[PDB]
Amino acid sequence: MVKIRLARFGSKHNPHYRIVVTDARRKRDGKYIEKIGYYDPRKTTPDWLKVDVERARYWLSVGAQPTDTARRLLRQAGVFRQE
Amino acid sequence: PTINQLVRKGREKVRKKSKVPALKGAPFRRGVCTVVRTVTPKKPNSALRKVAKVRLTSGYEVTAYIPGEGHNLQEHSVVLIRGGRVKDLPGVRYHIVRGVYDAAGVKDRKKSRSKYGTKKPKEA
Amino acid sequence: GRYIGPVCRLCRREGVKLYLKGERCYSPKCAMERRPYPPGQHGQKRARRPSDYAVRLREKQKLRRIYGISERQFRNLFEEASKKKGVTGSVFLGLLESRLDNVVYRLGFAVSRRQARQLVRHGHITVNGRRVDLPSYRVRPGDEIAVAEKSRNLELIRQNLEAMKGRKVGPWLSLDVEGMKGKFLRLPDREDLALPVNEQLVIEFYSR
Amino acid sequence: AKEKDTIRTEGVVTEALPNATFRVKLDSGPEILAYISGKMRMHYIRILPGDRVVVEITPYDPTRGRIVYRK
Amino acid sequence: PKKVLTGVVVSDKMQKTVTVLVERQFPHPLYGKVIKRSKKYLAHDPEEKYKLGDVVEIIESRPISKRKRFRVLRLVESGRMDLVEKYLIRRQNYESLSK
Amino acid sequence: MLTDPIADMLTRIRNATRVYKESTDVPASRFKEEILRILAREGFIKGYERVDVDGKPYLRVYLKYGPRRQGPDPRPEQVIHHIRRISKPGRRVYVGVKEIPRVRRGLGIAILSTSKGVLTDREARKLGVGGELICEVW
RNA sequence: AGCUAGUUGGUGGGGUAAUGGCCCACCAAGGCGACGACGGGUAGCCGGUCUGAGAGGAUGGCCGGCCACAGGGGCACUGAGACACGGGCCCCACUCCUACGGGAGGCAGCAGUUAGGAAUCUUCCGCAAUGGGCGCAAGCCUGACGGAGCGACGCCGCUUGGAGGAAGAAGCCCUUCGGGGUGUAAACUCCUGAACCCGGGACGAAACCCCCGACGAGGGGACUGACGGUACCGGGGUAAUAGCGCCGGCCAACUCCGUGCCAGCAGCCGCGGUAAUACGGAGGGCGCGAGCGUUACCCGGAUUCACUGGGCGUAAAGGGCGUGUAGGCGGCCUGGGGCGUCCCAUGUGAAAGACCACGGCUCAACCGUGGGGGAGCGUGGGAUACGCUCAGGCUAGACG
Ligand SMILES: [Mg+2]
Fold this sequence. Notes:
Largest interface: B-D, 11 and 12 residues
Largest sheet of chain C: 3 strands, antiparallel
Bound molecules: magnesium ion
Distance between the termini of chain F: 29 Å
PDB class: ribosome
Organism of B: Thermus thermophilus HB8
Radius of gyration of chain F: 16 Å
Order of helices and strands of chain C: HHHHHHEEEHEEH
Strand content of chain F: 25-35%
CATH superfamily of the largest domain in chain C: Ribosomal protein S4/S9, N-terminal domain
Oligomer: part of a larger assembly
Keywords: 30S, IF1, IF3, tRNAi
Entry title: Structure of bacterial 30S-IF1-IF3-mRNA-tRNA translation pre-initiation complex(state-2B)
CATH class of the largest domain in chain C: Mainly Alpha
Structural class of chain C: mainly alpha
Organism of A: Thermus thermophilus HB8
């Protein structure tokens, strides 16, 4: 399954996540196809979420299923706003 | 030589000769000893220096120098070897470690102790 | 950690008076004035002409001593300077001065660099609102350095402030005495600093 | 520190070995590699196989010594 | 695109098959010298069409045999012993210098 | 075998410089002539022309030296201090435009064989093209 | 130094998701090779890591990719996918029970035990985050992972106080007996208040779920913390671990006593055989510092394998010469081609790292964002000065 998912990139206690296009059966850290967004849960930054929306949309169109958290993030960013 | 020549032939990569067959690149090798024999130095030097002939965990049968003004070393005493060439003594490539295993520290060695494995002066 | 211990001995060794005690290091008492010779059993013996390397090393030590710094830290700073664009010399000096403790000292929030460092450690010093407790801190242009509210009413700090009421602040710094503040205006250059040291020598020593 | 165990036993010279070294049959017991002492070297002293000489012996190797006493 | 090569027909001693010596002219990475290195390539001739001494155009292909991965696309220049002949001489020499 | 012509020419020039001679003949070539022209433009030589020693095309290289210097070793200062064939037969050196050497840090020059003709280093840079690094002159 | 007989190619077939000597029948006798095969050794490879001015060199830990193997070997089956790490069959090797016929195994998963060994961790808690799999879903499963524990194992941060304080206590150590050192160091005064106790106290966690809305978008809601009562803040609050190397030269730093070529130090030159700035100790110093040194290894320095950048009359080194094969290399002029070569454009060069900028953790390490580079390689075009290559000429080389 082609998936939009997160990947741990940071450190112990300070996590950082890459919103990403990859196959299901990789490492969560694995050689992913495309970097589309990034997430800081600790909102330490004024910009904690920014995703390239168009790319994400394209991915979705192709067949990429977002993960629960990933999906939520995308929603927050506004990739589903069909208006 | 010439460029063409070089391409034909190749540059001989200088391989470094192992100074120490303590084997494997084992920084320390433990071993059981045979004899505590004292041997004479070289040509401008004269003394009687303390050498232990060691069977090693590497399976080497090498000659190792004992540092230390007063030593305790015996036959089947279990020893550790660090290496380091002794300039006067031939056959010797090895320093026995003091203050470990069965090469106990020099008594009242109280200046450059770290080399000899002798504990801090227990001051009171 | 830090040097810790007999300070003016170092000064004596180096030959140039250094202001690590702050005061007394101003009084006829830094031992430098009536005792110029280096510490030890061989102070009043003929000092043999100093070697190329040796002089450089001395210089390095002097500079390091000035800032009360671990050698490793100094090395790191040097490396950083080297990495960065421009004259490795002046930039290095700026970086050294950019240290929080040094900044505190040169704002006359303390008499001693050591004192300043101590103050920084124990939570007496505010930088732009947030109190920082690590003397290594990088102060950069347009940054404000204040005395803590818990610390404003402290005796020592008050004394220091009084001492600095009229006492000169650097052409890169601008302190508020009565609001107990201190703005950083410019990166402290070689020209700005009367440092009794030659950084070129240090650089030479280090490039090995 | 000096280990005081530097043994001072006497001996009949037995053999001319090369390079100022001498088999010296001890009066106590065995023959040992017994090189000439530095002092002796300094003051000439040609030792001959057939002299009474005193050897400085290590207890770690009592088969190796150093002639201290000429004649 | 599928790989295009230029070489010399060196052998016709096989059925439906021809041998092609590609010569390649390239710099040494370390020494900075142009070295005429080469390789042989076993090529498919669906006709027995091409003859010894022929300069040919070689295309990368779907495999036809193990160690046979190329079809000859087209003939470029026909008949030049000189280049073949060097190779032959080399081969002969290989026989000699030995024990 | 007169194996490299450019190199030979360079050598001849060097020799001439060493002995303070006004001129050497070199065997003729278009390439050689072009190189000479470039040198002249730069300022290393008084100039050149084609002449016929034994009815064979040859090229005069008119030499250039400094003033009669004072003291021991009074001999004039050499205009060309050094010249060196770099892209030798068998040793064909080739540079990209970012890899053209600043020969003597903007004082000496290097002579380049390129698409846009036989040209100097600065000129090459200007015309943003690399090539065969024939020779260095300082 | 030659190697090859399913070996190299063919026809026809099998077998495969598919090509193919993968296999099989038959025919042909090739195929590779010194432009280094086969044979032996060594070895996972790389993105990289260190070093280095760079070119290079070594190495491939962790992290990322791929390969390859799951006691050793062989084989299939099933399935989209395996010749199948915690599936199967079979043999060997091995441990375990056996009512002797036979079965059970596989930690190169986490943890740990044992062994080897210089040397390497807790039979830790959790499904909270991320991710995985199943499932409508709840939810389960999860030694992936999150974290804590141990080890200064590395890097980074901080503390072992600061301000005063003698023309200079004591103690220790030199001394030319006057003095000098340790050293403003201490002691003592002032000030702060790591430790430490109490008070609170997380970010990380908003979704999946419910309902409005069509189960779409959108909106409101609730559950949910291993780390962890930790980070961190608020109050009080004690001056509160300094160690190691060296001290002849390199190389920073000198005196005294003991010792007497001995005991010893040493990485090299070497010091020591009675006045040792090289030994043991003591002061003094100097360098680092919660580390410091030793050893092992690698690079450097070694421009000591030299491409950048070595040489070869005598130092190592011109083969005894000749002819000659491959190979390398090549005069002048004209034209094409444009392979080299150069150039532009773009594709690619994943991320992480390494560079620059900013941002976050009290700084930094560490990490996040953004950007550039980037050797090399592909594709399209261009350029012909220079190699190459074809074609023609020339007489300065060569040959007659
Ligand atoms: Mg003795």
